[PDB]
């Protein structure tokens, strides 16, 4: 079968061999013999108008469809384009593969065209970060770095190779392109141990009010495992921005309003898949004050952070729910704290979502953007099923917003932990082209969408069927609050009252612009049928968020939220007795 | 005098001690602290849509003024928005401060919103990235990193600090508020040693075909010595990108059509402030057949990358220049080499510059994007003076048409070294900025454009009177043209007919489409009197440019372009004798 | 209970918690802190001549023990006096703590004494490097730290930690002082999918010359479960050199002096927590030309490299081997390879063995290196059990001949992966301290000893009783030859007669020159009844060992040996000429 071949031919057949039928990119001449190979074996070349756009396209893929994608981008510049969008990867420990040029071996550290020490600028935000200086083990690397993105030796993530243009251009004898580096590998499954499973099992049967809080790993379930073990145990449940849409919203464990509730009174936090970082709270006892915790997640970044469990258990999450889920086969238990959070929650919960529709604008005449979650949940069941629905948010308030006013989506992507701005247009193409057949919604900010609105165009040319509905509110208004709250003066957080509908029918898509929210669900309807396209809602600046009342613009010492901070600040003072003295 | 302030008042007026008049940046509550007091010392805050565009715009002053310029951002996303940006910077030797915001230290590696490895990431393209804990010494790390950006301890360039949001609410008490920390510091003015330059007038003396080449360093002079030791020494003289308008156009020794027949032919190269990197073909003698080398800098940057001097003069260039001027004060230098260039270049030039006014359309039927440099050239004298106007380019084939159709420029600035695309809005931002009663005019490709445009809105909310002129050619053009030479096939190249006239009044600013090239200049006469404002021309795909040409897409193995790497390959081959052997 | 405490007493807290009961280290005022409040907690302080030789120790330890080992150093040239013994324990994935002193925050950047960017410098060779500048946050920071050294977020291997001394004397309010951060952890225990432990007995059934090669993740089990695989496989069986004494040397299996031939004929490698790494010719095809490969670790770092599994499981090595073994339950295996394989083994191996006794001085008069290992053989059931002994190698050429000399040991350690001359000395005092009742016997060069020799006088002052015997061949003897052999000019690695008996008796050690090989056993058991001890042994540089004339010293292209990189070249020609 084999022949010699040049480098930048087996990569594309590795990539292929891979599952890889697209890639995200922008070209330049040193990836051009990668780009050139992948168009030759039919994989599709998405090209973008900013690289960093092709890395969160790649993210959205992987998180949606759990293949491993991939961003293709030149050197210099072409490279150091996709920092935001790689460590917003590494956050979120997405896997992703970046594929960078570099200027040719003899020309290493003369100040040839586009220099810049890539490996050096990712590593710190890369499972690997590696030059490819070694024509006959390029094969080798790109399956090691793909397992390393897997999370083989780390943890799941990004990673980087760059192919000096030379070597791209040498030939790879037939008997070094081996057959287990092309193939494509299975998902690793480690399991259980039996001893880890009844500990656990023991926990939740002492417990009155355990609560399970899911996160990326759990995600990567089909959440049918973990039912299993909220029905087993009688747990409460919370989800996560990375984590929603596991559990049914009827299901008597799912209570996404009391979350405050639930961390305050919990005896048992079983973290799935989760990190115990800022979103919460730290795990710090501050904020979970009569919680034994339990962590259970497929790596160790998801179980030794901040807090450790009584029990941690390493393995595939789902086996691990099912085994516990086992192991409490004739246990009966007390769901009256439960059963108590979802009265008061399904209640709460109603009344919130059929308030969206009626919204009063705020003081300044203008829409409140609660007003564009009402229209989506009037339009459900008519022209689309939210059920079946990719919803993306993005920005400041208009995001805190929607972490409330989005409910019913079949996936949802925001700007992550990293609070990364601008992803709701790349991800909603990314999300478009994995799901060519299901409404791709992305509500952003106009401060979020300034930062990638050039990717309207990308959209347009690739046929990408997204929907971008902006809250022009003409601020960073999360930012403006908190300048105006605590130092008093509004300055360089005003934006302007720019014609997003505008921008969007000078790229090719179809536009709209809403004053008046009763035209809103009308507008949104004609979005939805002729995607791409845009609408541009003249929103209120008079519209305080959840996040913005709770101080996440102003960096507390301990804690992203001044009433963490505060419990944070009463803890540390607790029973330092005769020993304390003020700080004169 | 000096009280108790907190940190973050005390970096204020620092920077304004140092004479910053302006911040470029983006808000956020991790930095909101500085912003808020720059806001109370009157520093203007010129705020944009991307952070990259902020470091853009503080490169942009600093290269035209002289004045080390800041830019300033939030943690995780707001940072990593920089790394293009201070990378271009970096690669181009331009002091400049990033100070960008950081978690509180108490929740350092727990997972605090918007984490990640700044310093780390920054470090490669620095000359200092620092963490700054001690409340005490932060205006002493300032000011010695201010001192770094203009080069000492390393060379000029960018440098990174950020404090802590729990320092930056410290105070710093009244003794450390150091005076010799807060005050204004001039540049260093290293002398040359006599010695060395009696060497170099010696060398000019026995030349018959001497030739200087500036670059960055000579561009922090007025030209005046330069012209001195031109006129002293009859040397041949190129200018590069970096380093335009030194020289007047009509000198005798400016031949800036005949760059090949300098370099084939001089037998003494003299570099001044300039870099021998692939701009100048690695000073290789495969370029430079014929040269002795001299380099003259105040920066060993310029001294010893790929060529050595036979004489280095590390000083302060114009005190260089002067001393060798002085030291050939009875030279009568043979200039039959220098006058029989400039004859030839003379008429090329005037023939070349005339035939912009009337280029025919490519056969796409399209404007040849010469016609934009011609409209420009008609209306000089008229409604602008091109000598007072600050010129930008920025693209591919644009930007190589450019090089040849920018000749009356007060200042020149590009993608530089690192073809940075997208510097050409913020550029233009910074530079109307810096010079308010001075045309700013910036032309553009299509592809480059993209990247920055929404800065757009930008230039509006913050009236920088710019000009931006898109070559609209529906793709990346240079891109495309290597494609179809070297693999016959042009995939992820092609772009759409935007209307980039649209975007820019989305946002605010005056547009024009231009189909008809006969309808250019009342369109630039009308861009430059409605300003902010775009001219969006309708460009043909049918135009090689001088790099589309020379291979420059291609990245051969030891040059950046063709011509330049077939004589590397010869050089190789030179006197190797019996020793050689087949590669077989 | 919990009182505010400073963060120094509060480390000293959370490491005797986590099971640690001596400390390897050198003072100085950056740590005394910290070393103040280990000696008031009991915990045992073991101070060396030179911090590397503390790291080195506490490798030893861990590897040995199983239990996370700690070094403390102080700041600049304490910390990067630790690079060597770091990188080593990075190569070899061996957990350890080193805590390392560092300037007071209010003086960063400022040149401080003894300042210098430790984190920047170790970041490359560890799990994790920091510098910890909250108080409230150390111990979870040493928790956190303690977990990745086992492997978590990354694989086993060394962490660093420094806490600014200004930190050092901060108060921890008693409601931070967790218990769940102080309190030992037990290690991981990811558990096989039946699955892949189904297609792995698959394979073993349908194989027909199975081999087991076993490593770093095998050694970290009791060997019984390996055995038990062994049985049901019918596969022959080799170690490597970290991975000795897991199997009787008796078991049919165990096929040592065959080595290439296993490589050479097997038709499914099994590897047990081992890296393909050089030492095994990178599992190239060139080396295992008949070889699928299966791998088996609880790291991935011995899964990825270099050759993928048909199937790889990432478990426990004991329950996946275990596992594996119940799946063969009703296999009956084909051993004729094998049992082919371990006659002619039984023999050469024998052979070997009586040789040792009566090898003759090289042409220069001298000892061979190899009476050493025949004395310590004629020693065995007499003086001492080889078996119960704990057995270190170092150096060049007598490192090479202790590969094939040294056979009977309860556990055996050596310059590694890594080639990290000097390692005997320290590591057979971290061993000795460890195992009070066991004989331990280091066999090292004269080169490396130099490195590391006055750490004899730590083995005195801490009464390690250590047998220390040196191979003085007057040379870098393995070099010398590489030069003789392939340039035909010899500089720059000849050595002098040291007196090292002499050095170890000045440093309060038991002392004995051997020039007549015959006085080789009385000198080594005069040494065991003496210890801590050395032997200085007059050796010959005329004599070639296992290692010679295998392009050691050359460094090929692609393998380290020329007979490997050999079969690499030809494997890169095959089908070239072909295209059409
Ligand atoms: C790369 C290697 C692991 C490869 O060595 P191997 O071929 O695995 O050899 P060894 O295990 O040492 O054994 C070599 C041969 O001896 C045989 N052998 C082994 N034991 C015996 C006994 N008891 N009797 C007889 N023969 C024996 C074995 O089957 C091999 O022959 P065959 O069956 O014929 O193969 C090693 O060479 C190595 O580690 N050296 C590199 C240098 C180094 O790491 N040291 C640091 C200091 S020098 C660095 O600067
Ligand atoms: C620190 C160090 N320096 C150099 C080497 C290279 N090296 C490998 S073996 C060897 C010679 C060892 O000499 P010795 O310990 O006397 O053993 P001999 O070969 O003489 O038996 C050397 C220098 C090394 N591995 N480590
Ligand atoms: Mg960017
Ligand atoms: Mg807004
Ligand atoms: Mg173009
Ligand atoms: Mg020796």
Chains 1, 2 share one sequence.
Request: aromatic content about 4%; hydrophobic content about 40%; glycine content about 10%.
């Amino acid at each position: 079968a084999r022949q010699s071949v040049p480098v930048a031919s087996l990569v594309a057949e590795f990539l292929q061999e891979h599952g890889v039928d697209r890639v995200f990119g922008l070209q330049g001449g040193h990836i051009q013999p990668i780009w050139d190979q992948l168009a030759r074996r039919g994989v599709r070349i998405v090209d973008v108008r900013d690289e960093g756009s092709a890395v969160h396209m790649a993210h959205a893929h992987t998180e949606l469809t759990g293949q491993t994608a991939v961003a293709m981008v030149t050197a210099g510049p072409g490279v150091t384009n996709t920092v935001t969008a790689v460590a917003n990867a590494s956050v979120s420990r997405i896997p992703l593969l970046v594929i960078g040029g570099c200027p040719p071996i003899p020309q290493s550290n003369m100040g040839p065209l586009q220099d810049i020490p890539h490996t050096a600028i990712l590593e710190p935000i890369t499972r690997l970060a590696r030059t490819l200086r070694s024509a006959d083990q390029v094969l080798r690397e790109f399956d090691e770095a793909w397992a390393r993105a897997s999370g083989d030796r780390g943890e799941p993530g990004p990673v980087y190779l760059e192919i000096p243009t030379d070597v791209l251009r040498r030939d790879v004898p037939p008997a070094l392109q081996m057959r287990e580096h092309l193939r494509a590998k299975p998902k690793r499954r480690p399991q259980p141990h039996p001893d880890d499973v009844a500990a656990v099992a023991d926990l939740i049967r002492a417990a009155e009010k355990p609560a399970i809080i899911s996160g990326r790993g759990a995600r990567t379930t089909d959440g049918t495992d973990l039912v299993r073990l909220l029905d087993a145990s009688g747990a409460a449940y919370l989800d996560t921005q990375e984590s929603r849409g596991l559990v049914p919203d009827s299901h008597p464990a799912a209570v996404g309003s009391a979350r405050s509730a639930v961390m305050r009174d919990t005896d048992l936090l079983i973290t799935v898949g989760r990190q115990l970082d800022y979103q919460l709270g730290m795990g710090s006892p501050a904020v979970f004050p009569h919680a034994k915790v339990v962590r259970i997640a497929d790596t160790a970044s998801e179980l030794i952070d901040n807090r450790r469990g009584e029990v941690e258990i390493l393995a595939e999450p789902g086996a691990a729910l099912a085994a516990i889920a086992d192991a409490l086969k004739d246990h009966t238990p007390d769901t009256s704290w439960r059963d108590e959070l979802k009265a008061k929650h399904r209640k709460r919960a109603e009344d919130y979502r059929q308030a969206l529709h009626s919204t009063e604008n705020g003081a300044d005449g203008h829409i409140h953007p609660n007003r564009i979650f009402g229209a989506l949940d009037a339009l459900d069941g008519d022209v689309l099923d939210l059920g079946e629905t990719i919803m993306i948010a993005d920005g400041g308030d208009l995001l805190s917003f929607g972490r409330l006013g989005i409910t019913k989506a079949r996936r949802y992507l925001d700007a992550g932990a990293f609070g990364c701005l601008g992803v709701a247009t790349p991800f909603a193409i990314g999300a478009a082209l994995a799901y060519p057949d299901r409404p791709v919604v992305a509500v952003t900010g106009d401060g979020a969408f300034g930062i990638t609105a050039t990717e309207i165009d990308t959209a347009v040319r690739h046929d990408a069927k997204i929907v971008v509905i902006v809250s022009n509110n003409r601020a960073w208004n999360i930012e403006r609050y908190d300048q105006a709250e605590n130092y008093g003066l509004v300055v360089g957080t005003d934006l302007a009252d720019s014609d997003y509908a505008g921008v969007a029918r000078a790229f090719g898509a179809h536009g709209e612009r809403v004053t008046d929210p009763a035209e809103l669900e009308g507008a949104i309807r004609r979005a939805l049928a002729n995607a791409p396209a845009l609408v541009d809602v003249v929103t209120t600046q008079d519209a305080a968020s959840p996040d913005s009342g709770k101080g996440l613009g102003f960096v507390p010492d301990y804690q992203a939220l001044t009433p963490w901070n505060d419990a944070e600040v009463a803890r540390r003072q607790e029973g330092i007795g005769s020993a304390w003295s003020h700080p004169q």
